[PDB]
Amino acid sequence: RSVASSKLWMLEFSAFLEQQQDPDTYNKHLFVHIGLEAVDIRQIYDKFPEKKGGLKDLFERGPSNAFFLVKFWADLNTNGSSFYGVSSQYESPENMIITCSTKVCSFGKQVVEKVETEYARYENGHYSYRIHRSPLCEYMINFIHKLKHLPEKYMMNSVLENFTILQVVTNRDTQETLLCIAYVFEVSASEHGAQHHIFRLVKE
Amino acid sequence: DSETDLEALFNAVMNPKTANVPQTVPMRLRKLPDAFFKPP
Numbered sequence: 490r491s492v493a494s495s496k497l498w499m500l501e502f503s504a505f506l507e508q509q510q511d512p513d514t515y516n517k518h519l520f521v522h523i524g525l526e527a528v529d530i531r532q533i534y535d536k537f538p539e540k541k542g543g544l545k546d547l548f549e550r551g552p553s554n555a556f557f558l559v560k561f562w563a564d565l566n567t568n569g570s571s572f573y574g575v576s577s578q579y580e581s582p583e584n585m586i587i588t589c590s591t592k593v594c595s596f597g598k599q600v601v602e603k604v605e606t607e608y609a610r611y612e613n614g615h616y617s618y619r620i621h622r623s624p625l626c627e628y629m630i631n632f633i634h635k636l637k638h639l640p641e642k643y644m645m646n647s648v649l650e651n652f653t654i655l656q657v658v659t660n661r662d663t664q665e666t667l668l669c670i671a672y673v674f675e676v677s678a679s680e681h682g683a684q685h686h687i688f689r690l691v692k693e
Numbered sequence: 694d695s696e697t698d699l700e701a702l703f704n705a706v707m708n709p710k711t712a713n714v715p716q717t718v719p720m721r722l723r724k725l726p727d728a729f730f731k732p733p
Protein backbone atom coordinates (compact mmCIF):
# COMPACT_ATOMS: atom_id res chain seq x y z
CA ARG A 490 0.00 0.00 0.00
CA SER A 491 2.13 2.87 -1.36
CA VAL A 492 -0.50 5.53 -2.15
CA ALA A 493 -2.23 5.21 1.20
CA SER A 494 -3.11 7.51 4.07
CA SER A 495 -4.56 6.30 7.38
CA LYS A 496 -8.09 6.50 5.93
CA LEU A 497 -7.78 5.65 2.21
CA TRP A 498 -5.64 3.51 -0.09
CA MET A 499 -5.55 3.80 -3.87
CA LEU A 500 -4.91 0.23 -5.07
CA GLU A 501 -5.27 0.90 -8.78
CA PHE A 502 -5.10 3.86 -11.16
CA SER A 503 -4.99 3.78 -14.96
CA ALA A 504 -5.71 5.89 -18.04
CA PHE A 505 -6.39 3.99 -21.25
CA LEU A 506 -7.55 3.96 -24.83
CA GLU A 507 -10.02 1.22 -25.76
CA GLN A 508 -10.85 0.51 -29.41
CA GLN A 509 -13.74 -1.64 -30.62
CA GLN A 510 -12.48 -3.57 -33.65
CA ASP A 511 -15.80 -5.43 -34.03
CA PRO A 512 -18.78 -6.10 -31.68
CA ASP A 513 -16.84 -8.99 -30.03
CA THR A 514 -13.27 -7.64 -30.16
CA TYR A 515 -11.75 -4.89 -28.01
CA ASN A 516 -8.17 -3.65 -27.86
CA LYS A 517 -6.98 -1.68 -24.84
CA HIS A 518 -3.82 0.42 -24.51
CA LEU A 519 -2.64 1.75 -21.14
CA PHE A 520 -1.05 5.21 -21.12
CA VAL A 521 -0.26 5.02 -17.40
CA HIS A 522 -1.02 2.53 -14.61
CA ILE A 523 -0.50 1.93 -10.90
CA GLY A 524 -1.26 -1.56 -9.57
CA LEU A 525 8.86 5.71 -0.46
CA GLU A 526 11.43 8.51 -0.82
CA ALA A 527 10.51 12.02 0.27
CA VAL A 528 10.22 15.06 -1.98
CA ASP A 529 10.30 18.60 -0.57
CA ILE A 530 6.85 19.87 -1.54
CA ARG A 531 8.18 23.45 -1.80
CA GLN A 532 10.09 22.33 -4.92
CA ILE A 533 6.77 21.69 -6.75
CA TYR A 534 4.36 24.37 -5.43
CA ASP A 535 4.87 26.56 -8.53
CA LYS A 536 3.58 23.68 -10.68
CA PHE A 537 0.16 23.48 -9.03
CA PRO A 538 -2.73 25.84 -8.23
CA GLU A 539 -2.11 28.08 -5.27
CA LYS A 540 -4.27 30.27 -2.97
CA LYS A 541 -7.04 28.86 -0.74
CA GLY A 542 -7.78 25.22 -1.62
CA GLY A 543 -4.50 25.08 -3.56
CA LEU A 544 -1.62 22.67 -2.91
CA LYS A 545 0.14 24.64 -0.16
CA ASP A 546 -3.18 25.34 1.59
CA LEU A 547 -4.17 21.65 1.39
CA PHE A 548 -0.79 20.40 2.65
CA GLU A 549 -0.74 22.82 5.60
CA ARG A 550 -4.20 21.61 6.66
CA GLY A 551 -2.99 17.99 6.38
CA PRO A 552 -2.82 15.25 7.35
CA SER A 553 0.75 15.17 6.02
CA ASN A 554 0.50 11.39 5.43
CA ALA A 555 -2.17 11.90 2.72
CA PHE A 556 0.19 13.67 0.30
CA PHE A 557 1.98 11.99 -2.58
CA LEU A 558 3.83 12.82 -5.76
CA VAL A 559 3.70 10.35 -8.63
CA LYS A 560 6.07 10.60 -11.57
CA PHE A 561 4.71 8.85 -14.67
CA TRP A 562 6.53 7.80 -17.81
CA ALA A 563 3.55 7.61 -20.17
CA ASP A 564 3.20 5.11 -23.01
CA LEU A 565 1.92 7.02 -26.05
CA ASN A 566 2.70 4.31 -28.60
CA THR A 567 -0.82 3.56 -29.84
CA ASN A 568 -3.30 4.24 -32.67
CA GLY A 569 -15.65 6.52 -34.14
CA SER A 570 -15.00 3.37 -32.10
CA SER A 571 -12.65 4.68 -29.40
CA PHE A 572 -12.95 5.35 -25.68
CA TYR A 573 -10.46 7.28 -23.54
CA GLY A 574 -11.04 6.31 -19.93
CA VAL A 575 -9.65 6.58 -16.43
CA SER A 576 -10.14 3.81 -13.89
CA SER A 577 -9.26 3.87 -10.19
CA GLN A 578 -9.94 1.76 -7.11
CA TYR A 579 -9.80 2.63 -3.41
CA GLU A 580 -10.23 0.87 -0.07
CA SER A 581 -11.06 2.20 3.40
CA PRO A 582 -11.91 0.83 6.85
CA GLU A 583 -14.64 3.50 6.85
CA ASN A 584 -18.04 3.75 5.15
CA MET A 585 -17.79 7.24 3.64
CA ILE A 586 -19.09 9.26 0.74
CA ILE A 587 -15.99 10.43 -1.11
CA THR A 588 -15.44 13.08 -3.75
CA CYS A 589 -12.60 12.85 -6.22
CA SER A 590 -11.45 16.13 -7.77
CA THR A 591 -8.97 16.01 -10.65
CA LYS A 592 -7.42 19.28 -11.86
CA VAL A 593 -5.35 19.59 -15.02
CA CYS A 594 -2.82 22.42 -14.86
CA SER A 595 -0.64 24.35 -17.25
CA PHE A 596 2.17 26.43 -15.72
CA GLY A 597 0.57 25.76 -12.32
CA LYS A 598 -2.73 27.29 -13.50
CA GLN A 599 -5.92 25.21 -13.49
CA VAL A 600 -7.25 24.57 -16.99
CA VAL A 601 -10.03 22.08 -16.19
CA GLU A 602 -11.48 20.24 -13.20
CA LYS A 603 -13.40 16.95 -13.21
CA VAL A 604 -15.35 16.04 -10.06
CA GLU A 605 -16.80 12.64 -9.12
CA THR A 606 -18.80 11.38 -6.15
CA GLU A 607 -18.31 7.78 -5.03
CA TYR A 608 -20.24 5.57 -2.64
CA ALA A 609 -18.97 2.58 -0.65
CA ARG A 610 -19.44 -1.13 -1.24
CA TYR A 611 -18.75 -3.57 1.61
CA GLU A 612 -15.93 -5.99 0.74
CA ASN A 613 -14.22 -8.53 3.04
CA GLY A 614 -14.07 -6.48 6.26
CA HIS A 615 -13.48 -3.16 4.45
CA TYR A 616 -15.22 -0.71 2.12
CA SER A 617 -14.31 -0.48 -1.58
CA TYR A 618 -14.72 2.56 -3.84
CA ARG A 619 -14.36 2.27 -7.60
CA ILE A 620 -14.33 4.87 -10.34
CA HIS A 621 -14.98 2.63 -13.34
CA ARG A 622 -14.38 3.77 -16.96
CA SER A 623 -14.61 7.48 -16.21
CA PRO A 624 -14.56 9.43 -19.49
CA LEU A 625 -11.33 11.34 -20.09
CA CYS A 626 -12.11 15.02 -20.80
CA GLU A 627 -11.87 16.47 -24.31
CA TYR A 628 -8.93 18.62 -23.16
CA MET A 629 -6.93 15.51 -22.25
CA ILE A 630 -7.83 13.76 -25.52
CA ASN A 631 -6.71 16.81 -27.53
CA PHE A 632 -3.55 17.17 -25.42
CA ILE A 633 -2.59 13.55 -26.20
CA HIS A 634 -3.35 14.06 -29.91
CA LYS A 635 -1.17 17.20 -30.02
CA LEU A 636 1.65 15.40 -28.16
CA LYS A 637 1.69 12.48 -30.60
CA HIS A 638 1.79 14.90 -33.54
CA LEU A 639 5.01 16.50 -32.30
CA PRO A 640 7.98 15.55 -34.57
CA GLU A 641 10.41 14.77 -31.73
CA LYS A 642 10.19 12.95 -28.39
CA TYR A 643 12.25 15.69 -26.74
CA MET A 644 9.50 18.15 -27.74
CA MET A 645 7.01 15.90 -25.93
CA ASN A 646 9.00 16.07 -22.69
CA SER A 647 9.49 19.81 -23.16
CA VAL A 648 5.71 20.32 -23.31
CA LEU A 649 5.21 17.95 -20.36
CA GLU A 650 7.59 20.04 -18.22
CA ASN A 651 4.71 22.45 -17.55
CA PHE A 652 1.83 19.98 -17.50
CA THR A 653 0.58 18.60 -14.18
CA ILE A 654 -2.45 16.86 -12.69
CA LEU A 655 -3.64 17.22 -9.09
CA GLN A 656 -5.98 14.62 -7.62
CA VAL A 657 -7.65 15.38 -4.29
CA VAL A 658 -9.88 12.73 -2.72
CA THR A 659 -12.03 14.16 0.07
CA ASN A 660 -14.61 12.94 2.56
CA ARG A 661 -17.57 14.91 1.18
CA ASP A 662 -19.24 15.59 4.54
CA THR A 663 -16.14 16.43 6.63
CA GLN A 664 -13.93 17.87 3.85
CA GLU A 665 -10.99 15.86 5.23
CA THR A 666 -8.19 15.18 2.74
CA LEU A 667 -8.13 11.40 2.32
CA LEU A 668 -5.53 11.44 -0.49
CA CYS A 669 -3.79 14.18 -2.44
CA ILE A 670 -1.72 13.10 -5.40
CA ALA A 671 0.36 15.42 -7.56
CA TYR A 672 1.16 13.90 -10.97
CA VAL A 673 4.15 14.79 -13.13
CA PHE A 674 4.80 13.30 -16.56
CA GLU A 675 7.46 12.24 -19.01
CA VAL A 676 7.22 10.09 -22.12
CA SER A 677 8.29 6.47 -21.75
CA ALA A 678 11.39 5.66 -23.82
CA SER A 679 11.60 2.08 -22.57
CA GLU A 680 10.91 -1.38 -23.99
CA HIS A 681 8.91 -1.96 -20.77
CA GLY A 682 6.30 0.67 -21.67
CA ALA A 683 4.58 2.75 -18.99
CA GLN A 684 6.50 3.22 -15.73
CA HIS A 685 6.10 5.15 -12.48
CA HIS A 686 7.69 6.14 -9.19
CA ILE A 687 5.85 7.23 -6.04
CA PHE A 688 7.17 9.75 -3.51
CA ARG A 689 5.96 11.11 -0.18
CA LEU A 690 5.52 14.87 -0.09
CA VAL A 691 7.16 16.43 2.97
CA LYS A 692 7.33 19.99 4.35
CA GLU A 693 11.14 20.31 4.12
CA ASP B 694 -2.05 36.62 -23.22
CA SER B 695 -3.22 33.48 -21.39
CA GLU B 696 -1.00 31.03 -19.47
CA THR B 697 -3.52 28.20 -20.03
CA ASP B 698 -3.47 28.65 -23.85
CA LEU B 699 -2.91 25.14 -25.26
CA GLU B 700 -1.80 26.33 -28.72
CA ALA B 701 0.79 28.68 -27.16
CA LEU B 702 2.10 25.84 -24.98
CA PHE B 703 2.74 23.62 -28.03
CA ASN B 704 3.87 26.54 -30.21
CA ALA B 705 6.58 27.37 -27.67
CA VAL B 706 8.36 24.05 -28.34
CA MET B 707 7.56 23.70 -32.07
CA ASN B 708 8.52 27.28 -32.92
CA PRO B 709 10.85 28.56 -30.14
CA LYS B 710 11.37 31.89 -31.98
CA THR B 711 7.72 32.77 -31.35
CA ALA B 712 7.48 31.25 -27.85
CA ASN B 713 5.24 33.34 -25.61
CA VAL B 714 4.89 31.38 -22.36
CA PRO B 715 6.05 31.75 -18.73
CA GLN B 716 9.75 31.01 -18.22
CA THR B 717 10.39 28.30 -15.62
CA VAL B 718 13.11 26.27 -13.88
CA PRO B 719 13.51 22.89 -15.65
CA MET B 720 12.82 19.94 -13.31
CA ARG B 721 16.33 18.52 -13.85
CA LEU B 722 17.84 21.64 -12.26
CA ARG B 723 15.72 21.33 -9.10
CA LYS B 724 16.50 19.69 -5.75
CA LEU B 725 14.90 16.31 -6.49
CA PRO B 726 15.86 12.65 -5.95
CA ASP B 727 17.70 10.75 -8.72
CA ALA B 728 14.74 8.36 -8.93
CA PHE B 729 12.67 11.28 -10.25
CA PHE B 730 14.63 11.25 -13.51
CA LYS B 731 15.62 7.58 -13.74
CA PRO B 732 12.71 5.20 -14.50
CA PRO B 733 12.62 1.85 -12.59
Ligand SMILES: *C(=O)CCCCCCCCCCCCC
Binds near residue numbers: 654
Ligand atom coordinates in the same frame (compact mmCIF):
# COMPACT_ATOMS: atom_id res chain seq x y z
C1 LIG C 1 -10.54 15.89 -17.61
O1 LIG C 1 -11.66 15.61 -17.26
C2 LIG C 1 -9.39 15.72 -16.64
C3 LIG C 1 -9.28 14.24 -16.23
C4 LIG C 1 -7.82 13.80 -16.23
C5 LIG C 1 -7.72 12.41 -15.60
C6 LIG C 1 -6.25 12.04 -15.40
C7 LIG C 1 -5.86 10.92 -16.37
C8 LIG C 1 -4.35 10.95 -16.62
C9 LIG C 1 -4.08 11.07 -18.12
C10 LIG C 1 -2.76 10.39 -18.45
C11 LIG C 1 -2.54 10.42 -19.97
C12 LIG C 1 -1.08 10.79 -20.27
C13 LIG C 1 -1.00 12.23 -20.80
C14 LIG C 1 0.46 12.58 -21.10
